């Protein structure tokens, strides 16, 4: 996400103010386009163990209901010009048939009475006896965001969190990891108090250090 400033003290980010004056002049000189990179800031909640200093895996409680994790898709479809064309073709031929067809219907019926209806004898007493529809029900989510709520869902540690769903975060007190102070109410580096340094903890080892 693009931030105007740090939200931790509400004080100007230096990388952001420069970034934007350079970016915005770009009818003038096109290579000043990569300067926007200094504005983009990563948004994630980062736990730090107190005894080893590394990221543990554990789950924080996040109140109903998700403002992200959609990941919607882009596509192109050009094969639907063929589907459209035959749909209308099959529709049209029936209309034309209207005059021949009346004469057929009278002769057609006795054939069905004798043999079978369509794949079994059963249910030839009406022309159609079975109508309806199996679903009419659909409301998806019960609101786009339900604020502070009593409904929990679980979120992982190092997940894509935006500030709107970041507020709903409450670090659990069953597990070891609870902040030394309190939460700050936003995304960012936050150091957590390790209850057990001697019980097994699942950790995520940073990418650069594995490769080294």
Partner 1 sequence: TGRDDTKETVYISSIALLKMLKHGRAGVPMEVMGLMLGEFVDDYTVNVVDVFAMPQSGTGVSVEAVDDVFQAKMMDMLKQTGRDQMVVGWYHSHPGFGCWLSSVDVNTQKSFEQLNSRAVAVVVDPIQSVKGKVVIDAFRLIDTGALINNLEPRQTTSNTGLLNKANIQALIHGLNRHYYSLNIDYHKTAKETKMLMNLHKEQWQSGLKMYDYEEKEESNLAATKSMVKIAEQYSKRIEEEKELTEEELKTRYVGRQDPKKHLSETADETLENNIVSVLTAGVNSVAIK
Partner 2 sequence: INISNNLQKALTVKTNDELMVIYISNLVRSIIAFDDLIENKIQNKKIQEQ
Partner 3 sequence: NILSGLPTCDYYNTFLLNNKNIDIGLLNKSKSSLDGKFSLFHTAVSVANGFMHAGTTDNSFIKANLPWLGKAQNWAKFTATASLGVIHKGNLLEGKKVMAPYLPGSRASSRFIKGGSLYGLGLIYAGFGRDTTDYLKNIIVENSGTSGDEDVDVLLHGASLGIGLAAMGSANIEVYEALKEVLYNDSATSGEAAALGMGLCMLGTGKPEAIHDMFTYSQETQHGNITRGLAVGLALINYGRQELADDLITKMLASDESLLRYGGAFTIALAYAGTGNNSAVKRL
The reply to whether 148 sits near partner 2 by the rule CB under 8 A is no
| Strands (DSSP E) found in the chain | 5-6, 11-12, 45-48, 55-56, 60-63, 152-155, 169-170, 178-179, 188-193, 203-204
Shortest reach from residue 14's CB to partner 3, in Å:
6
Dihedral pair phi/psi, residue 15, rounded to 5°: -65, -40
Decide whether 138 or 212 has the Cβ nearer to partner 2. 138
- Quick one: which segment of 85-93, 105-113, 134-142, 169-177 binds partner 2 (CB under 8 A)? 134-142
Residue from 112, 141, 156, 196 binding partner 2 (CB under 8 A): 141
The reply to whether 192 sits near partner 3 by the rule CB under 8 A is no
The reply to whether 31 sits near partner 3 by the rule CB under 8 A is yes
Shortest reach from residue 20's CB to partner 1, in Å:
20
The reply to whether 204 sits near partner 3 by the rule CB under 8 A is yes
Instruction: Provide the b/e sequence for 138-169 (b: ≥16 CB within 10 Å).
Output: eeeeeeeeeeeeeeeeebebeeebeeebbebb
Cβ neighbourhood burial of 65 (10 Å; 0-12, 13-18, 19+): middle
Tokens encoding 145: 């965001």
Measured CA to CA, the distance from residue 55 to residue 58 in angstroms comes to 9
**Cα distance from N-terminal residue to C-terminal residue, the chain:** 29
Residue from 9, 10, 27, 73 binding partner 1 (CB under 8 A): 27
Tokens encoding 97: 């048939």
Shortest reach from residue 209's CB to partner 3, in Å:
7
Tokens encoding 209: 């250090």
Residues within the interface to partner 1 (CB under 8 A): 27-30
Residues within the interface to partner 3 (CB under 8 A): 5, 11-12, 14-15, 17-18, 21-22, 25, 28-31, 33-34, 36-38, 40, 42, 44, 46, 55, 71-76, 158-160, 189, 204, 206-209, 211-212
Residues within the interface to partner 2 (CB under 8 A): 139-144
């Amino acid at each position: 996400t693009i931030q105007l400033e740090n939200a931790d003290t509400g004080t100007l980010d230096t990388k952001s103010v420069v970034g934007l004056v350079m970016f915005s002049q770009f009818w003038y000189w096109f290579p000043l386009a990569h300067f926007l990179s200094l504005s983009f800031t990563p948004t994630t909640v980062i736990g730090i163990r107190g005894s080893d200093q590394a990221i543990p895996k554990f789950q924080m409680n996040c109140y109903a209901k998700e403002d992200a994790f959609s990941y919607p898709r882009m596509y192109e479809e050009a094969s639907g010009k063929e589907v459209e064309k035959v749909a209308t073709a099959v529709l049209s031929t029936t209309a034309r048939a209207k005059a021949r067809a009346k004469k057929t219907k009278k002769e057609k019926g006795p054939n069905e009475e004798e043999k079978k209806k369509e794949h079994e004898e059963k249910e030839k007493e009406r022309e159609t006896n079975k109508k309806g529809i199996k679903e009419t029900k659909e409301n998806d989510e019960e609101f786009y965001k339900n604020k502070y709520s009593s409904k929990p869902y679980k979120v992982d540690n190092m997940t894509r969190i935006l500030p709107q769903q970041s507020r709903y975060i409450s670090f659990i007190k069953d597990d070891r990891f609870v902040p030394v102070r309190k939460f700050k109410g936003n995304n960012g580096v936050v150091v957590l108090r390790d209850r057990e340094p001697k019980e097994p903890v699942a950790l995520i080892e940073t990418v650069r250090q594995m490769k080294d």
